[PDB]
Design a protein around this ligand. Structure first.
Ligand code: NAD
Ligand code: NAD
Ligand code: MG
Ligand code: MG
Ligand code: ZN
Ligand code: ZN
Ligand code: ZN
Ligand code: ZN
Lengths: 414, 412
């Protein structure tokens, strides 16, 4: 879209009217509407989005996750686009750059950045207000009563829109290192792939000859399998109840699979994992990527006491917003870390991830996650924001299809 | 020892778990027991003193002992090798030893990692028995019948003589021959746990900020470590003002009485308010046993960068603890810790050298209320003075100013 004389763009975006509480439909809350996107201020990028792709956390967001008051909103944190314009103070970006902009920036000067061992930057942390720091939004719409109304972001931006505004301290560019990378690949690099790959590579720090357990092989868990295989793990144990995704995981380098719904009475997933290791010692690295609170506990219990790290990537709407651990196993060697975006720092680590993503085996793995067809640039599960709300609502139901690993939302021509 | 090498001595027997509504008198008694001679690589140890870890009181309440009663209590204590099994190496009769929960085989992938004491080969003896299902301890009951006593784990310390697998023992007498017994006793658990949690596990550096949740003997040992390592800020959280003041005397910079916070202010929010930009602490130590403080310690840590070290224990519903999910995902970093990650061969010799330094010794003396002239501690009971004196001492564990009760077992 071309801006009007005041620099405002009118474009399609996916609006969430309110939380979809249990028993409510997508139809109750989700609608494609025309929105107005204000021009970028200060160090902001306004970004022509190519595609978004559906993270389970996007579905949690529809259900009200981390948004007690921040409706109506434009959804989405997983996506890729092209810089269309920039605020006047912007440095180190140009119009035409291809960017992703995940939740955490990297100031490189706080004690967290300088530690070398985390991406939880003190200066560019999660924008939980879902607003600009002055309480405004670059997004608005004209409702049925003709009134101009504010739309919240997801966090520091929204990706389910033809045009997004994001603070450039959260952006990192793809076009210098990977000018030929297709859009849906760039989209999963913004969250799902970075998360599973980085949880294994950076956070669990998997070494050649390590044993790895992965609880949940959706897009995040399969990304973890691809990393564990690249890093020459001796053993890659995948746990899930979805036989399709367990089989995909086995095709991309998992060595052992466990269907948690088919375990003998009184055999826990952690016991099943331990049974596959020498003297039932457990795994060198335990990844949770399910959102199932039970699996966070089972992941902790699967890890070799003291030596191994359990990396929790999963998210969900839990009773009292709490998770639980078996205390005796926890005290006697538990080691559990929260992980966002795989610990992949947007300046220090993302460039090497992007170079890795171009290696043939890693690309084949991304193609499999996406069911990508390079001839048509279409993914197996794809919906286009220009095709209207009914198509989108059907696609959101089909996220639960057994063979839907990653739904893609096409936003603009490629 | 009799004709068969069996020692008859006093020990503190727990008959059954002390469940809520029961008294110490219901379950705790000083009795004469028989201690068999050591076999294989065992040490039989003349105990000098035990000292009361909060986990000793949890044991009385049934902690980790669903079936392992009756037992001799105790895992914190120090003694002198009286005899050894025929296969023992690297120990002599007369050596002063402690024998904590975890050994250090030095060859398993956990030992070889260099970053944990959770040895795969010498782990916790949860059976509370010898590997053949027998015990070195027994007693003659009122029926005149000979009956087995369980250990605590690999041994019991609340006895004049104990037997332990020498793969769990480490000697005090070469590095610290003049160390008083109660100091050796707290080195075996409380002081190693608090000091190690800060020094080894949280790896506190000069200029770091530290929060310690619970300033009993473990948390005060953590204060001593944080001071020794030149932490910029040492924040202590407790309900007990006497122990908070003691922590401040031994190096703490800021104290918070959790029971005097406004209802809407959490312990983690109070700790973060003491830190620049409410960023929280570089190292967060839980040493309370209060499940709430395990969650608050996790939340007080700088997101991602900092480590929360959980040392606390308790009897929790369904044996489960909980964490606030959003704060956990966005940077939580929590580890279970046993004995301060202090490995009995690689780390304990260094800890023991540290204990001999005047400031650290002064801190151990303050924990103990130790009088060097009388070798008496502020709170001390002798096993030879009878069950009623012990039952009153066990009640006095809860006294405001009781940091560490010592159970004297033999002349020093
Ligand atoms: N931490 C982060 O930065 C980050 C990034 C991506 C996603 N997430 C979260 O991580 C998780 C994985 O993301 P995703 O998009 O791959 O999710 P997904 O829903 O596509 O995949 C999760 C997988 O876990 C399995 N699983 C869920 N509940 C299960 C149960 N009860 N029994 C057995 N298997 C079960 C599912 O069958 C599925 O294969 C989600 O919880 C998501 O919200 C977080
Ligand atoms: N992990 C290990 O190897 C190891 C070693 C020693 C002790 N422990 C455990 O660590 C903890 C500390 O041991 P200790 O012997 O110093 O215990 P302690 O009982 O002497 O001291 C605990 C301190 O925490 C405070 N605390 C407890 N509940 C509180 C609450 N509700 N509000 C505020 N403050 C509270 C108490 O007032 C006290 O000062 C205990 O849970 C003990 O079982 C474990
Ligand atoms: Mg802005
Ligand atoms: Mg033995
Ligand atoms: Zn995501
Ligand atoms: Zn930073
Ligand atoms: Zn103890
Ligand atoms: Zn070992």
């Amino acid at each position: 879209a071309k801006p009007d004389k005041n620099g405002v763009i009118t474009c399609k975006a996916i609006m969430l009217k309110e939380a979809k509480l249990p028993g409510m439909s997508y139809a109750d809350t989700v609608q494609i509407i025309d929105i107005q996107v204000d021009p970028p201020q200060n160090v902001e990028l306004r970004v022509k989005m190519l595609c978004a792709s559906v993270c389970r956390t996007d579905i949690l967001t529809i259900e009200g996750f981390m948004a007690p008051t921040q409706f109506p909103k434009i959804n989405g944190h997983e996506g890729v686009g092209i810089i269309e314009s920039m605020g006047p103070d912007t440095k180190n970006f140009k119009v035409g750059d291809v960017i992703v902009a995940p939740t955490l920036g990297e100031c490189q000067t706080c004690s967290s950045c300088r530690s070398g061992r985390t991406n939880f930057c003190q200066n560019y942390g999660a924008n939980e207000s879902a607003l600009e720091p002055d309480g405004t939004s670059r997004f608005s719409y004209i409702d049925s009563d003709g009134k101009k109304k504010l739309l919240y972001y997801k966090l520091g931006c929204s990706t389910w829109t033809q045009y997004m505004v994001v603070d450039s301290n959260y952006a990192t560019k793809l076009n210098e290192i990977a000018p030929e990378l297709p859009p849906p690949h760039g989209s999963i690099l913004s969250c799902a792939f970075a998360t599973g790959y980085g949880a294994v590579w950076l956070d669990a720090a998997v070494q050649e000859g390590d044993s790895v357990a992965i609880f949940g092989v959706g897009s995040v868990g399969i990304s973890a399998v691809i990393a564990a295989k690249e890093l020459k793990a001796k053993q890659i144990i995948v746990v899930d109840r979805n036989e399709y995704k367990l089989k995909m995981a086995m095709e991309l380098g998992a060595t052992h699979c466990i269907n948690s719904e088919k375990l003998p009475e009184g055999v826990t997933p952690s016991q099943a994992v331990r049974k596959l290791t020498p003297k039932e010692v457990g795994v060198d690295a335990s990844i949770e990527s399910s959102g199932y609170d039970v699996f966070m506990n089972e992941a902790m219990k699967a890890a070799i006491h003291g030596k191994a790290k359990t990396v929790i990537t999963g998210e969900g709407i839990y009773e009292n917003d709490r998770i639980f651990f078996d205390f005796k196993d926890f005290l006697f060697g538990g080691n559990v870390v929260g992980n966002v975006t795989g610990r992949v720092r947007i300046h220090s680590d993302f460039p090497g991830l992007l170079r890795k993503a171009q290696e043939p085996v890693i690309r084949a793995g991304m193609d499999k996650i996406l069911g990508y067809d390079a001839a048509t640039m279409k993914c197996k599960y794809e919906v286009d924001i220009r095709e209207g709300t009914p198509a989108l609502l059907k696609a959101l139901e089909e996220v639960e299809n057994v063979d839907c690993v990653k739904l893609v939302i096409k936003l603009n021509d490629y």
